[PDB]
Amino acid sequence: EDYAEETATSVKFKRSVTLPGCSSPLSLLGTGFREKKFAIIGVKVYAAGYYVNESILSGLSAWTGRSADEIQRDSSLFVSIFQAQAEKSLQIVLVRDVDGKTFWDALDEAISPRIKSPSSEDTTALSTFCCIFQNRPLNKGSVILLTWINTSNMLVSVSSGGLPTNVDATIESGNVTSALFDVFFGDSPVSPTLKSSVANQLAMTLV
Ligand SMILES: CCCCCCCCCCCCCCCC(=O)O
């Protein structure tokens, strides 16, 4: 159809989308959910959809004909996706309210271990990134867009509902851009389902 459904949360993701600051429409490559245990039982925090400009597919021809499992366990393939000279974006849709401390804790846990010694440029990028979320309630239904323009530039947008239409911030930092990608597609993805979904789709596409 025109929309895909994320199994666990039932959140719908349009298969082809036009995103803020992106010239060409992007195609949905995978979906998944992120769950976390704050107390006793794990709960679903958000649904996520990863999009890519179809132009990056040609750049992954070295992996043609590989299985989903081979693709999933190949770090070089995901690094190649990150390095591709095209636009990619992650659409996060909150399925529960997220308060300030919860948000900062998660951001710190994701960034800090990956950037032990931030450069002045990284600090500036992170400050700009955080400013967008400061004094901003992240209630259920909120949509966050993390768009990769290149290996060092990202466009970030947030809405309280519906796909953002504006670019809230543009940041420059290879370390921050790389760190955020690793959060979702590295060895310990926060959303194993999202990574597996992307791997499966790539296996079908790189045939
Ligand atoms: C566990 C609650 C976290 C709330 C997630 C809100 C989405 C913010 C997107 C910015 C990326 C920050 C990386 C951390 C991702 C994560 O821990 O789920």
Side-chain angles (χ1 to χ4, degrees), residues 34 36 38 45-46 92 94 98 102-103 106-107 110 129 133 138 144 146 180 183-184 190:
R34 194 277 202 256
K36 183 166 182 178
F38 298 103
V45 185
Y46 62 82
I92 292 173
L94 300 186
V98 173
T102 296
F103 182 76
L107 184 58
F129 184 92
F133 298 99
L138 288 182
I144 295 170
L146 300 180
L180 287 175
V183 168
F184 298 96
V190 288

Side-chain angles (χ1 to χ4, degrees), residues 33-101:
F33 69 87
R34 194 277 202 256
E35 71 176 312
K36 183 166 182 178
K37 179 188 292 183
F38 298 103
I40 308 301
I41 67 174
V43 298
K44 300 190 179 66
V45 185
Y46 62 82
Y50 186 60
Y51 293 84
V52 300
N53 184 303
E54 274 183 346
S55 64
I56 75 166
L57 297 177
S58 65
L60 307 174
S61 62
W63 288 272
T64 57
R66 303 213 173 190
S67 70
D69 284 355
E70 293 181 300
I71 283 179
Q72 163 133 182
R73 57 177 64 113
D74 193 330
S75 292
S76 296
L77 175 46
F78 285 95
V79 170
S80 292
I81 288 175
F82 174 75
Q83 297 173 328
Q85 311 64 44
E87 316 155 327
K88 309 97 179 188
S89 181
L90 188 67
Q91 183 190 330
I92 292 173
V93 182
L94 300 186
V95 291
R96 68 180 292 109
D97 294 346
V98 173
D99 69 5
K101 64 173 181 293

Side-chain angles (χ1 to χ4, degrees), residues 193-205:
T193 50
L194 171 65
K195 187 173 178 179
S196 294
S197 178
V198 168
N200 297 325
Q201 183 57 56
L202 280 176
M204 295 286 98
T205 301

Side-chain angles (χ1 to χ4, degrees), residues 100-119:
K101 64 173 181 293
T102 296
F103 182 76
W104 300 127
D105 282 349
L107 184 58
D108 188 56
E109 194 179 309
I111 292 294
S112 295
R114 295 180 168 79
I115 313 180
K116 295 297 177 56
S117 295
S119 66

